[PDB]
Amino acid sequence: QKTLHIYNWTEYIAPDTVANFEKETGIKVVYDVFDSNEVLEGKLMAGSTGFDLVVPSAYFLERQLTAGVFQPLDKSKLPEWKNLDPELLKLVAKHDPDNKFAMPYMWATTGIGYNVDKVKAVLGENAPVDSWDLILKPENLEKLKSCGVSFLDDPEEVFATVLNYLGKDPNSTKADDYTGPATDLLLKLRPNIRYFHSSQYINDLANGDICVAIGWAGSVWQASNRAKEAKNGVNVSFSIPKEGAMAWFDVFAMPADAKNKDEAYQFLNYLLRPDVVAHISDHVFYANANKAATPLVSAEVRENPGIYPPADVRAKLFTQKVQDPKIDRVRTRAWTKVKSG
Ligand SMILES: [Cl-]
């Protein structure tokens, strides 16, 4: 019997991807899901996970290439590797030099999801939906409070977004940037924020319970699609603001103790087939990292500049850099202070 154990995010594959793979290969796939990066990182560090393929962020990969948690990918077993977009390979390479350990899977940004009609009713037809001003100017958030404002419960992404908005290095290494101006702004915004949570805003956007949220692009586009299918009239959109936004990349990686490597390479090369990953993007509303696949993606998705942004927008995106542990503890303490009154 041939088997393959995969650990991926929830709602990060097409409903029939695994079934199609099993039919084509005769491999028994055990597909498990996690809903938070803390759960994944915890298992990876403990080792002996029993997984042949896992889906970490590229950022986490850099923090583990010296630890040897993953093994290098044999490109000779991945003949369709050439389909991957070289620009995205370069960005991932900043965490995984020479792309030795990770295969780029999907990527997106952290921007603003919003209810089109409610924002325009509160702030006017000319509401600054193309700017972080929509959600980071206190005067605007005070008006939007009643219709619901949510932020991610992710200090790393939120502080980097605030720092960039203030004109500072989004990956600032100065502790006082976090405890001072970044915290000062967040505390001015806090009384207008309904909650900090990294998933509840999907359904709340789709149902009309919140009007503006900091969120992951594909999660917001999923909310927009859920609202359409519900025929409730809720019109959700997403913005990569003009001041820039954090871009991030989820990748497939192979733990060093993977027990079914041959099956894992079959699955990776399966994902490299243009129609396979294009079909996933069609369902999850995330851009994949496969350049050959882009023309096969549904027009509604590939033509959406909030999913596949053009060159001018991509040049405004920043990626997360690793920090010294002191800065990590500073961000955690400051985040608790922001959230607690
Ligand atoms: Cl990343």
Residue numbers in the entry: 29 to 369
Recite the paper's sentences.
To gain insight into the evolution and designability of ligand binding and specificity, we analyzed the homologous PBPs, PotF and PotD, which are Escherichia coli putrescine (PUT)-binding protein and spermidine (SPD)-binding protein, respectively. They constitute the first elements of two separate multicomponent uptake systems (PotFGHI and PotABCD) to transport the cationic polyamines PUT and SPD across the cellular membrane. Still, the protein-binding modes differ: PotF shows affinity for PUT and SPD, whereas PotD exclusively binds SPD. Prior to this work, we grafted the seven differences in amino acids from PotD binding pocket onto PotF; this resulted in PotF_SPD, which will be referred to as PotF/D throughout this work to keep naming for mutants more concise.
PotF/D solely binds SPD, whereas PUT affinity is abolished. The observation that SPD affinity was solely maintained and PotF/Ds crystal structure adopted a semiclosed state led us to the approaches presented in this work. Closer examination of PotF/D revealed that two mutations interfere with wildtype-like salt bridge formation. Although D39E would increase the length of the one residue involved in the proximal salt bridge and partially open the structure, the exchange from Asp to Glu still allows salt bridge formation in general. However, the second mutation S87Y seemed to have a much bigger impact on the ligand recognition of PotF as shown in the prior analysis. In PotD, this Tyr faces inward into the binding pocket to coordinate N3 of SPD. In contrast, when introduced in PotF/D, this Tyr turns outward and disrupts the salt bridge between E184 and R91. This observation explains the negative influence of S87Y on polyamine binding in general as well as the lack of affinity improvement in PotF/D, as the Tyr does not only disrupt the salt bridge and thereby obstructs complete closure but also is not able to coordinate N3 of SPD. In PotF, this Phe points inside the binding pocket, but in PotF/D, its rotamer is vertically flipped by ∼180°. It appears that F88 and Y87 repel each other in PotF/D, driving both residues away from the binding pocket and eliminating PotD-like positioning of Y87.
